[PDB]
Write a protein that binds this DNA or RNA. Structure first.
Ligand SMILES: [Mg+2]
Ligand SMILES: [Mg+2]
Ligand SMILES: [Mg+2]
Ligand SMILES: [Mg+2]
Ligand SMILES: [Mg+2]
Ligand SMILES: [Mg+2]
Ligand SMILES: [Mg+2]
Ligand SMILES: [Mg+2]
Ligand SMILES: [Mg+2]
Ligand SMILES: [Mg+2]
Ligand SMILES: [Mg+2]
Ligand SMILES: [Mg+2]
Ligand SMILES: [Mg+2]
Ligand SMILES: [Mg+2]
Ligand SMILES: [Mg+2]
Ligand SMILES: [Mg+2]
Ligand SMILES: [Mg+2]
Ligand SMILES: [Mg+2]
Ligand SMILES: [Mg+2]
Ligand SMILES: [Mg+2]
Ligand SMILES: [Mg+2]
Ligand SMILES: [Mg+2]
Ligand SMILES: [Mg+2]
Ligand SMILES: [Mg+2]
Ligand SMILES: [Mg+2]
Ligand SMILES: [Mg+2]
Ligand SMILES: [Mg+2]
Ligand SMILES: [Mg+2]
Ligand SMILES: [Mg+2]
Ligand SMILES: [Mg+2]
Ligand SMILES: [Mg+2]
Ligand SMILES: [Mg+2]
Ligand SMILES: [Mg+2]
Ligand SMILES: [Mg+2]
Ligand SMILES: [Mg+2]
Ligand SMILES: [Mg+2]
Ligand SMILES: [Mg+2]
Ligand SMILES: [Mg+2]
Ligand SMILES: [Mg+2]
Ligand SMILES: [Mg+2]
Ligand SMILES: [Mg+2]
Ligand SMILES: [Mg+2]
Ligand SMILES: [Mg+2]
Ligand SMILES: [Mg+2]
Ligand SMILES: [Mg+2]
Ligand SMILES: [Mg+2]
Ligand SMILES: [Mg+2]
Ligand SMILES: [Mg+2]
Ligand SMILES: [Mg+2]
Ligand SMILES: [Mg+2]
Ligand SMILES: [Mg+2]
Ligand SMILES: [Mg+2]
Ligand SMILES: [Mg+2]
Ligand SMILES: [Mg+2]
Ligand SMILES: [Mg+2]
Ligand SMILES: [Mg+2]
Ligand SMILES: [Mg+2]
Ligand SMILES: [Mg+2]
Ligand SMILES: [Mg+2]
Ligand SMILES: [Mg+2]
Ligand SMILES: [Mg+2]
Ligand SMILES: [Mg+2]
Ligand SMILES: [Mg+2]
Ligand SMILES: [Mg+2]
Ligand SMILES: [Mg+2]
Ligand SMILES: [Mg+2]
Ligand SMILES: [Mg+2]
Ligand SMILES: [Mg+2]
Ligand SMILES: [Mg+2]
Ligand SMILES: [Mg+2]
Ligand SMILES: [Mg+2]
Ligand SMILES: [Mg+2]
Ligand SMILES: [Mg+2]
Ligand SMILES: [Mg+2]
Ligand SMILES: [Mg+2]
Lengths: 134, 265
RNA sequence: CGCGACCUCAGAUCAGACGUGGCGACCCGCUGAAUUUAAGCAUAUUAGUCAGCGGAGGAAAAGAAACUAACCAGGAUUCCCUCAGUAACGGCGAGUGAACAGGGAAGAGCCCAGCGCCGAAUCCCCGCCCCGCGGCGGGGCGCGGGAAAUGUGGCGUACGGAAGACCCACUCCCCGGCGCCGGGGGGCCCAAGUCCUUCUGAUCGAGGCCCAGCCCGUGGACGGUGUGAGGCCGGUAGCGGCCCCCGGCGCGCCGGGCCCGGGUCUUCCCGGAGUCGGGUUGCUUGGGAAUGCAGCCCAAAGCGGGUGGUAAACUCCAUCUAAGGCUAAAUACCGGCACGAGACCGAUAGUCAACAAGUACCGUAAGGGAAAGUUGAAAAGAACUUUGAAGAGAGAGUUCAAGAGGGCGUGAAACCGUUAAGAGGUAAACGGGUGGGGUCCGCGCAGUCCGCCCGGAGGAUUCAACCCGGCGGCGCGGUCCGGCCGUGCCGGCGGGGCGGAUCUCCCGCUCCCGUCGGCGGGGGACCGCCCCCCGGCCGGCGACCGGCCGCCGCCGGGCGCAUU
RNA sequence: ACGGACCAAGGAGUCUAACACGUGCGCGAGUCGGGGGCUACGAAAGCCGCCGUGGCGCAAUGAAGGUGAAGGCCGGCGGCGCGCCGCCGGCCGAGGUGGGAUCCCGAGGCCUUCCAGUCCGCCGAGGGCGCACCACCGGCCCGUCUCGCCCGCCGCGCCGG
RNA sequence: UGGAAUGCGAGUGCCUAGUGGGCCACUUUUGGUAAGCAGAACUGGCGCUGCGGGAUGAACCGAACGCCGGGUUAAGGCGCC
RNA sequence: GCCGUCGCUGGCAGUCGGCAGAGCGAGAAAGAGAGUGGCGCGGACGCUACGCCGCGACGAGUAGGAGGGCCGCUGCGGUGAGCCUUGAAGCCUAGGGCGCGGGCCCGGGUGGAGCCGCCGCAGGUGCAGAUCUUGGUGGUAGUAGCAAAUAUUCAAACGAGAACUUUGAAGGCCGAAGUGGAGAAGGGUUCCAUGUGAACAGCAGUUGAACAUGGGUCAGUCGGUCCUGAGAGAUGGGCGAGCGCCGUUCCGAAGGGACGGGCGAUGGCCUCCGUUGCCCUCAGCCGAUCGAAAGGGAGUCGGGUUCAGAUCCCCGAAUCCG
RNA sequence: CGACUCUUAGCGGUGGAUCACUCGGCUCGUGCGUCGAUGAAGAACGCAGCUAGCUGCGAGAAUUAAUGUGAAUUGCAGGACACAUUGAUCAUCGACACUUCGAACGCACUUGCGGCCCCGGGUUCCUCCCGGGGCUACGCCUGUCUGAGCGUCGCU
């Protein structure tokens, strides 16, 4: 149950703030769980998805064990495009099929200075909570 | 809104133009011109008797009657038949009323609360709240009321030392402070017989809060329990007693059905 | 004549400032109807309301009595409850209509002119130096300028005030700089299943996840994601974490300002004028021989003046102190900024406006003012072949579905085409009664099921009767033991809580002499009720039970092995 | 005689206030906290009691000043002359008549082999206490009228009863 | 000997809607030449009411009404319709 | 016979069982009374008492009243371990039924995501009408009609397609108060080139002022610009609660200018002249301002040139003002 | 026969009811409670590579700077020697900027006429021309300067 007086649980307000979210907020909304190996390694559960990440599709027609590179994060449409997750049009040209980030698992992360900073911050806040309970 | 239907300068054409005499929108050059207006039979008009914010939404209930209602709810909460007839799965609860030691007032983790309900055999009631969780039919979904579920046990405590935070995440559970009991919580829907779990300290304050028959309430300035109109409700035992039985005439249980009339001639 | 002061008045693109317009929900000042009611209508009502004009602020206005009262008196203003639909007004008709007291919200009090004393002790601006400098100020220095005796500043204002004398008591209070130590806004982050089967176009669905109970839970709000999700993502929870900025509260240094009070006596001083008040006129009010306001005329007093709800004279009383000024809070808020919620509506509804809506469009203008939501999970939005000038078609293909094909979810009625069946010269339709024919249904077509009994064929986790154990019911066990227990009754050196408009050794203040009486605060006793302790009767355990004993029933296991 | 060509959707006794009566619930000569205060759902609910101010009810009547809701018997004395009035002490005491649901008593009576006489019940002429309610008759309180004789005193009155 | 017959259970109180245009007939009856005219009394109707008969018809005659079977009737009928 | 209403304010707690004993409907009060002396283990249903059962009578209805609805609609508290992608709502149906009825159930189809029962609460809760509102659709009806102003015809071309377009040729009309050539007001891109032939152009179109893609307006001299006209309109002033209004020379210190002269200051082609400050001298205009693309108002003509502009561009020849 | 007509049903149309959805309303509550001559509200015209409307912005014009964020924006193209302490994008927003009218301000309201000061280019010291910049509205307060009067006077 929610008790914060300044947080709305209104359905219309929560959908409007999802579908009008600005680009830097859609990034956070567009987050994917990490693999079991990555989750153990970094102590992080989810990361915002990024171009050049390698993911597994775990839901839908294209689910399986195939790992593909993230080739486009279409934040406007709330989907990512993944290598080999595609189909053909009538004229035979191949077109990418959009997958929501919540339906993939990140197997390899595209690491740079800022990404290593974000992983570190997430892992530290987690440990503060674990010691708080302990 | 008090303006709905009235933000126009519509005027009746009057008779003679072969149309009904409803006030009509003025001007021209748009679909709206010459259409009906204002009246409650018109599209875009004003409704009949527009609702007002000074409808009397609130009701006064006498204190003596509200306390009467809290007493009936508690009396009906200690009878297995009424609690079972309220839908609560109390077929294995050791006793009714269910009183648990005061340690439970100091629980902190939700897992302790769950385990206690399992050893008190109040977990079947919770599992029935999980089975009743579903979506609500109608516009309520559009109005922040999408999920419906049945009420579970009510836990009544004397002092809160983590018990509220322990129990509040278990669906169907309602916490109540014994000194601030609510009929809306003790008789949900207006039906008596909600399953209540009592802490020992909460159970011991009841006499003070509502008074016995001999002793007036100590925590209410002037109040005592409502008196009974019938001291022995066991109608069967009254009727089968020798005193009543000796005063009766013998029953007449022979049926005298209609007699077909045969012509004597 | 000239020169120079002052006064009154001019011009400056003079130096530096300030006002204008907007918005207007709430607020203040004006002005101000008529629909309407009176079953007509003129007073009245509507209504001090709509419209009109001016002026504001985060609130405004009001406000520290020329008050209420008539009490044993209260004590600024505003608001809430009540007073009260009352006193009163009113073609005394329709209708209208307050206040005081009482209970609350809030609570805060002050300052001039005057009368006086102080050598104008006062103020503004320019120039230079130090400090600060996006709220333009602090200090220092100018034989710098001006204002101001046609009156600035300090003391002081009705609760009295001042000066002097005598007793008593005094060192912290503020201004401008500088340094150090402990709510608000923003940013980032923090639990747990995408586990095994399985349904599906896809699923968040169903089933399961050892004892024990998949895992987390201070988090099972909500949203998203190809259903329907606490555990997939964002979130949610948490006196959770980290990082910025702003503020508030504290402590020291520097340079300034103040040189500060109480009581008792002595002597002095003390107030707002074309205003009050009166006449009259008009408006206004519940205010009635006139409540408030305004115009004109008259026009004050100083033990006076005003009020004292019926005009006036006389006379006592009570109560204030007008004609100058400031003041937070409690109160209001359909505008604005930012939020939260709902027993509301759900695209002819709800705002006119769910959408390129105050838009398109109409009017010279003031103004008037709509219609209009939905493919799909995903555009995968139909390549290619073929007829046609093309629109359109036929195939093909995508999709779970185009029997979803770009104004595409579903897809009603009216109305229309076609197919099928029936029928047809008193328009059609209609009630009742049959008959014929259809469409489909009985998932019909040798026709029910059940108890007991007789007989023939079989087969057994085989019957009764006894034995062991468990459980249950009942018992007037004619009167067994133990319990709890009486919204029962009696006896107590019983250990206590509540109440009393029942009575009465300790102390605080205070009148009188160190005495002695009163107000207030406290024991104690007594009375009623209740709780807990112990003894005696009766008494329940059918809203309230255990052990033994007896009877009965049931179950499990033995034995009975077959005319059952 | 008027409206109605046809189909869909919309479309008209509502809400606030006041009053009256009926009904249901709570408490009851009381009752009501509504305003105020205290202590996610919750703007809820709980509480106040030296917060019951206050409303309504518990008293009416008169324009008002005002007044404001049973008596009798016994004994004693004073005055008038057995009866009356005034003042003193003791006893009883909220009226009566008719009707009146219900309740109470009970003349007599409710069978089995025949008599006596019991316990529990049961019916019943007649007789009683009489609810509510109605009719009638008395009484009491306030306004007003007529008649009339007394009683009180810090105020001896154009006094008060 | 509840003091004529016959029949029938009565009394009482609150609140209350619609109505407040009527019209027709036997008999009586006013005005009028009269009127399917205007205006009264009494009772009954229609209004509010179908049903059998008067071919048809607000009021005439019979009779009043739940959904049925059988029987019998009223007023009216029985050449054919 | 059946249904309902009313009445009997009728009957049933007695289902009192092997701790047993079955009855109380019958013309005519009150006990199936209690006592004291003289083998089998068995026996239907019932009773949501707001239930169940019996007997008798009755049944018209506008206006109007009342009752009961397990009639229907939307939402709220409870409950149904309710339903549902193995298919919700909605919709359709010569399918099977239930109910006096309001209505409801089930079958089949379509549909694609939510919905309902019961106890209570609440209401913007039930349509045939209102010359009702809004939207849609009929018959009329392939009907009225596409008739004002004399008129067309031949050949060819493009083209899928020609009565209507283009070219040529005939026959006609307007008949210089034009159906010609140019402007003002108004329009605002309609102008010009190319393309289209969906919609529109009340037949058609190969065409258009439609649609689409791109272009096109050149000035000292032609207008505006300036003047004043009838008039409008600030200031001073007056009035006015006030936004403001009256008024335009009227209650006004209404000139910011000048030939010249005298005092200075600055500069430069520094010789002496400019500029500049002050003083002297001189000074009616007497009403700010707006007001005309037809009035007043200097000065441009010839030729050529484009798809569309030209007294504007280019060539030539001029001219006014400063 | 067969048309036509009527009824019912299948299918197909016309139509957009119903149902389910809701980034919209409506109502209540809370906190704050801030416009302008430093030029507001409002209006006009512009601004994008392809851009009509809406939206946003103002010749620095679908935005500059800064801070946070941390790899996009996206309908297509493109990538400035755009791309990770050489920072995409979004957000915040304190710096800078902000055309014309409008209280609207030189006078007028036609993009009409000026005046003063300074600067630059023609020219060549002044002039003259062109361009740029700054000023030039009403009221009103304090002060300043320059004045006026047969106003009151003083000395001459
Ligand atoms: Mg509306
Ligand atoms: Mg629904
Ligand atoms: Mg100046
Ligand atoms: Mg009237
Ligand atoms: Mg009237
Ligand atoms: Mg009238
Ligand atoms: Mg009047
Ligand atoms: Mg008035
Ligand atoms: Mg107004
Ligand atoms: Mg105004
Ligand atoms: Mg203003
Ligand atoms: Mg403001
Ligand atoms: Mg005042
Ligand atoms: Mg006060
Ligand atoms: Mg009253
Ligand atoms: Mg009034
Ligand atoms: Mg008061
Ligand atoms: Mg207070
Ligand atoms: Mg003074
Ligand atoms: Mg005072
Ligand atoms: Mg998570
Ligand atoms: Mg599962
Ligand atoms: Mg979820
Ligand atoms: Mg979801
Ligand atoms: Mg789960
Ligand atoms: Mg989280
Ligand atoms: Mg948090
Ligand atoms: Mg004063
Ligand atoms: Mg007036
Ligand atoms: Mg008046
Ligand atoms: Mg008087
Ligand atoms: Mg003030
Ligand atoms: Mg719509
Ligand atoms: Mg609408
Ligand atoms: Mg519609
Ligand atoms: Mg709808
Ligand atoms: Mg609409
Ligand atoms: Mg739709
Ligand atoms: Mg489909
Ligand atoms: Mg579809
Ligand atoms: Mg869809
Ligand atoms: Mg649709
Ligand atoms: Mg469709
Ligand atoms: Mg058909
Ligand atoms: Mg046929
Ligand atoms: Mg009519
Ligand atoms: Mg008609
Ligand atoms: Mg009542
Ligand atoms: Mg709330
Ligand atoms: Mg007549
Ligand atoms: Mg009638
Ligand atoms: Mg009748
Ligand atoms: Mg009849
Ligand atoms: Mg005849
Ligand atoms: Mg018959
Ligand atoms: Mg005949
Ligand atoms: Mg009837
Ligand atoms: Mg059909
Ligand atoms: Mg869908
Ligand atoms: Mg509603
Ligand atoms: Mg309807
Ligand atoms: Mg309709
Ligand atoms: Mg024709
Ligand atoms: Mg011409
Ligand atoms: Mg021409
Ligand atoms: Mg055509
Ligand atoms: Mg053309
Ligand atoms: Mg003027
Ligand atoms: Mg001009
Ligand atoms: Mg001209
Ligand atoms: Mg030339
Ligand atoms: Mg553009
Ligand atoms: Mg930037
Ligand atoms: Mg950046
Ligand atoms: Mg002009």
């Amino acid at each position: 149950m929610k008790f914060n007086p300044f947080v709305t649980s209104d359905r219309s307000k929560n959908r409007k703030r999802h579908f009008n979210a600005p680009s830097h907020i859609r990034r956070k909304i567009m987050s994917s769980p990490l693999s079991k190996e990555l989750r153990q390694k970094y102590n992080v559960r989810s990361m915002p998805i990024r171009k050049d990440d390698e993911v597994q599709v775990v839901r839908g027609h294209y689910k399986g064990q195939q790992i593909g590179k993230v080739v486009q994060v279409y934040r406007k449409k709330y989907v990512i495009y993944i290598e080999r997750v595609q189909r053909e049009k009538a004229n035979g040209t191949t077109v990418h099929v959009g997958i929501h980030p919540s339906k993939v698992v990140i197997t390899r992360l595209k690491l740079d200075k800022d990404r290593k900073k974000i992983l570190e911050r997430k892992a530290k806040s987690r440990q503060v909570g674990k010691e708080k309970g302990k | 809104s008090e303006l709905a239907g009235h933000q126009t300068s519509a005027e009746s054409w009057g008779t003679g133009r072969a149309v009904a005499r409803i006030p009509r929108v003025r001007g021209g050059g748009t679909h709206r011109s010459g259409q009906g207006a204002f009246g409650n039979m018109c599209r875009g008009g004003r409704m009949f008797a527009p609702t007002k914010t000074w409808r009397r939404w609130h009701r006064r209930v006498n204190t003596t009657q509200k306390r009467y209602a809290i007493c009936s709810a508690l009396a009906a909460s200690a009878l297995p038949a009424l609690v079972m007839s309220k839908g609560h799965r109390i077929e294995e609860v050791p006793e009714l009323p269910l009183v648990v030691e005061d340690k439970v007032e100091g629980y902190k983790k939700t897992k302790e609360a769950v385990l206690l309900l399992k050893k008190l055999k109040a977990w079947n009631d919770i599992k029935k709240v999980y089975a009743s969780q579903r979506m609500r039919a109608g516009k309520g979904k559009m109005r922040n009321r999408r999920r419906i579920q049945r009420r579970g046990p009510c836990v009544i405590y004397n002092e809160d030392n983590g018990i509220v935070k322990a129990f509040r995440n278990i669906p169907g559970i309602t916490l109540l402070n014994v000194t601030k009991l609510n009929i809306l919580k003790l008789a949900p829907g207006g039906h008596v017989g909600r399953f209540c779990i009592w802490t020992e300290s909460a159970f011991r304050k009841l006499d003070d809060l509502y008074g016995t028959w001999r002793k007036a309430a100590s925590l209410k300035s002037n109040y005592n329990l409502p008196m009974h109109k019938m001291l022995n409700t066991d109608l069967s035992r009254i009727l089968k007693s020798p005193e009543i039985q000796r005063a009766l005439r013998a029953p007449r249980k022979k049926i005298h059905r209609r007699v077909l009339k045969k012509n004597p001639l």
